């Protein structure tokens, strides 16, 4: 059954709760973003109202084939009413179309659900600043002090300079970027922009990008692999074997590959700065691991929560074992004692 952390008290609303069949009492199902863990169970066969951003609605319509009658897209930064209750959707700084939701309960309680998010100080000057928030449902993916990572902009600058140098040294080199879902689009679009190229990709991936309301998208992407010097491939193919194989496929139009695997955290975040990063190399193929994160680091999460000062925190990630829950509660108490709420 639907866990308490996916329910919003004093409404019949749920959030990211599609895998449990009909939820007893639920009149509206919110979807924070289009990642399969969160949407799991949604398909053309679902027949209840789904509330979400415009981008998330385009994906539901076109990729999942959910019937249009059940999609209720809502604009951002706008006070709306859903089944008698005031809500606001905010940018989560996660993947395209990802939202946090602010719920103003009839009793006067205010609840923020972050969805998946990468906390940022720009969130301190949104509609959140205008009133007290009593309860916070928090993306706790990286809630431990070992999880540090560079800013998105440091990582993109590194990727840009790296790609530019390599293709100026060898104008017959191909750049490959790995991908599995939506998110991290800036990696491949920034590389392409410094090389004066479109990004080539499969028909399924092009269809996905065409849903995302990216300005001038038709000038940036193509399904003609031949005509482009930055290609997208599935993350699974980003290895020496998969990359040599793809290089055979391109018809001797390129004689070298430089590939990027955008990952989350891995253990080498604890020493190495982005400037020290060096690739793995085998012959004419080089692979760079770059920690481009769309979740809060420990310090980013801690700052946001210390600013917000919630009366209660409900974790939404890593809640499946008591050891994890216990560890997270410890950090929440530390943050509260330090900041005086
Ligand atoms: Ni996500």
Swiss-Prot record:
Where are the disulfide bridges? none
The protein's induction, as recorded, is:
During mitosis. The mRNA encoding this protein contains an internal ribosome entry site (IRES) in its 5'-UTR. This 5'-UTR generally suppresses translation while specifically promoting expression during mitosis, when cap-dependent translation may be impaired.
Q: Where in the cell is it found?
A: Nucleus
Protein name in UniProt: DNA cross-link repair 1A protein
State start and end of the fragment within the whole protein. Answer: 700 to 1040 of 1040
Query: What does the sequence similarity comment in the record state about its family?
Result: Belongs to the DNA repair metallo-beta-lactamase (DRMBL) family.
Q: In which tissues is it expressed?
A: Expressed in brain, heart, kidney, liver, pancreas, placenta and skeletal muscle.
Q: What does this protein do?
A: May be required for DNA interstrand cross-link repair. Also required for checkpoint mediated cell cycle arrest in early prophase in response to mitotic spindle poisons. Possesses beta-lactamase activity, catalyzing the hydrolysis of penicillin G and nitrocefin. Exhibits no activity towards other beta-lactam antibiotic classes including cephalosporins (cefotaxime) and carbapenems (imipenem).
Q: How does it assemble?
A: Binds constitutively to TP53BP1. Binds CDC27, which is itself a component of the anaphase promoting complex (APC). Binds PIAS1.
**Organism of provenance:** Homo sapiens
What does changing residue 295 to A do?
Impaired nuclear focus formation, reduced interaction with PIAS and increased sensitivity to cisplatin
